[PDB]
């Protein structure tokens, strides 16, 4: 069931307040991003290890010092994996 409007209670506002639940803690598998792996320039620097089929399609991000956005996701193409890394402006 979708919706277009900001839930009201998140403007009460807002300390006071319910003393609402925490989100769950970070599970161990999002601790590591395969992009940080370049075992491979020996000699094909594009090779990554096999991903982990839980983490297909999760956005990852990275600091550039260049004033653009670094984004990436991993996906199955037929039986092979493509991690695409996008460099993109903000405007």
């Amino acid at each position: 069931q979708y919706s277009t409007e900001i839930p009201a209670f998140l403007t009460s506002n807002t300390l006071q307040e319910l003393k609402l639940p925490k989100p769950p803690s970070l599970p161990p598998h999002l601790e590591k991003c395969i992009l940080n792996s370049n075992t491979a320039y020996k000699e094909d620097q594009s090779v990554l290890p096999n991903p982990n089929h839980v983490l297909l399609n999760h956005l990852a991000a990275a600091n550039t010092q260049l004033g653009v956005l670094a984004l990436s996701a991993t996906t199955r193409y037929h039986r092979k994996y493509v991690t695409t890394a996008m460099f993109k402006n903000f405007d």
Partner: protein, 324 residues
Amino acid sequence: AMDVQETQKGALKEIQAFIRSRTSYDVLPTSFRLIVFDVTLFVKTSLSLLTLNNIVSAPLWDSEANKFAGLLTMADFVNVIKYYYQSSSFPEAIAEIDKFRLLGLREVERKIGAIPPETIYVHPMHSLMDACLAMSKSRARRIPLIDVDGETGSEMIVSVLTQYRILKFISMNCKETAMLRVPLNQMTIGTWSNLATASMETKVYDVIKMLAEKNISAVPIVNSEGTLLNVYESVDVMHLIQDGDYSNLDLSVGEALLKRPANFDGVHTCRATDRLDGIFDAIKHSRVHRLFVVDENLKLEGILSLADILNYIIYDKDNFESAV
């Protein structure tokens, strides 16, 4: 079938058959990285991104349409520089580049003749032959593998295939490379006259004009005696302009070759008596982009290029530089 040049004859036959029976998909590693730029990135940024990620090329993404927007290679820069040198009476006009977004660089090229209207690309599930024919129909030395997600109509850039990685693939997968035992000087392959050559004294922009005019990816540097010393590659141009110093173009080749990081695929040489069997082996274990053919005393005789080799196996027996 049972002697050199009849054994080679047959061996080539298997190799093309091998090529046709595989797909571009098949060449790809089972899990790899692909770096993609927004077409609206500024030129300086994109240069900084190639160097930092250690790459010489990247496919462009037109993100509003979700469409492949061209392939960015050192050729784009080599062609714009040539143009400015041949046309502008103003040496500092080249500096203007830095203001361009990749999209506006591509328009200048479009307007200047330097680009196809039709983007070369192929479906990754089509035949590997498809990839070669295209890369040899246009003299492009790499090609995008593009598919389409029918749920959105958006395009899916799967990879970019280089000539080098097709040949490596062939070197590792075809036993029949070892049966190509015919010396180069018997076959008809490579260029053996009218070499574009340069010396240390030569100016970089003259080397760049040679590169654009002959649609060649590299230029050999020789001494007065014509011994081979080194090479000046279109990828070398990236290292001179990486900091916005477009005056590094007035450097002599020698000066510019000192700014080179170690890193450098090296320069590969063979004798004229060398055969294709050994070369596929050099390829199997090392990153060769071309072979300079030399004599006892390292004197240049000619050039055996990757296109050259691909073209020799795939076929049955002044302006502008293509994607590099």
